[PDB]
């Protein structure tokens, strides 16, 4: 296919998000967009990346192509990307190599990399569910809370109610309890905390995978947490003018 994108910083951030947690994934390319849906090494977490046709400056796909990418090599290649170099992702109808082309507007520099593709991607289904508690906070505050509480222990205890969410850890040097409350302002995109409570939730999660998910913080200013008893946690980030990242993690029980 052929996808031309002008602001490559976004894609760089996405890779930096998923480069370290997931190593190899499978990209389902269609006339609608780029779709990634994978698990991690220890089969605990799940990543759902969706980039849409309307976001790219020139997207052209014909049929569903399923290419197996190793996000570490790709992340290195996107580290090689110029910030003003217009970026063209491209692939051949049947070739086993994906081409990345960085090209300067006025200047005379053209970086041309070609990464080998692969082919094994056990994709489980996600029932379009309704979750008991749904918090919408800034991504920075979730990042903070996870970092801070990562020093105490390996597990976090999320207790969501009608007006506030509570985080709890208990390790070898003490215990910790953070508590966030509701918004009282007329302009707070990524400054407000809002809870969508239908039944208060009490869930136990692991902090390592939450920090892995947290590495994707610079992508969106707002995170949405979605919890319900006995079902995984949904951490959702918006990709500005494109798609979304959704991270799923199975509780401790």
């Amino acid at each position: 296919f052929e996808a031309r994108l002008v602001q490559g910083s976004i894609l760089k951030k996405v890779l930096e998000a998923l480069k370290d947690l997931i190593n190899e994934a499978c990209w389902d390319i269609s006339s609608s967009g780029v779709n990634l849906q994978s698990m991690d090494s220890s089969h605990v977490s799940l990543v759902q990346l969706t980039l849409r046709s309307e976001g790219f400056d020139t997207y052209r796909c014909d049929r569903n192509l399923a290419m197996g990418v190793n996000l570490t090599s790709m992340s290195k290649i996107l580290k090689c990307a110029g910030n003003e170099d217009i970026i063209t992702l491209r692939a051949e109808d049947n070739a086993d190599t994906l081409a990345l082309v960085f090209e300067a507007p006025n200047q005379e520099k053209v970086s041309d990399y070609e990464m080998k593709l692969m082919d094994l991607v056990e994709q489980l289904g996600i029932p379009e569910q309704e979750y008991s508690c749904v918090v919408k906070m800034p991504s920075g505050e979730f990042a903070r809370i996870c970092r801070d509480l990562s020093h105490i222990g390996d597990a976090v205890v999320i207790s969501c109610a009608k007006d506030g969410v509570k985080f709890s850890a208990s390790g070898e040097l003490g215990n910790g309890n953070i508590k966030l409350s509701q918004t009282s302002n007329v302009d707070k995109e990524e400054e407000a905390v809002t809870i969508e409570m239908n039944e208060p939730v009490q869930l136990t999660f692991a902090l390592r995978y939450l920090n892995f998910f947290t590495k994707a913080t610079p992508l969106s200013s707002t995170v949405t947490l979605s919890m319900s008893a006995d079902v995984p946690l949904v951490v959702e980030y918006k990709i500005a003018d494109m798609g979304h990242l959704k991270y799923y993690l199975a509780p401790k029980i």
């Binding site: 089969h43 605990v44 977490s45 799940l46 489980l124 799923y248 199975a250 509780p251 401790k252 029980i253």
Partner: peptide, 8 residues
């Protein structure tokens, strides 16, 4: 803890 294949 719970694995993520329990689910879905």
């Amino acid at each position: 803890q719970c694995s993520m294949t329990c689910f879905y």
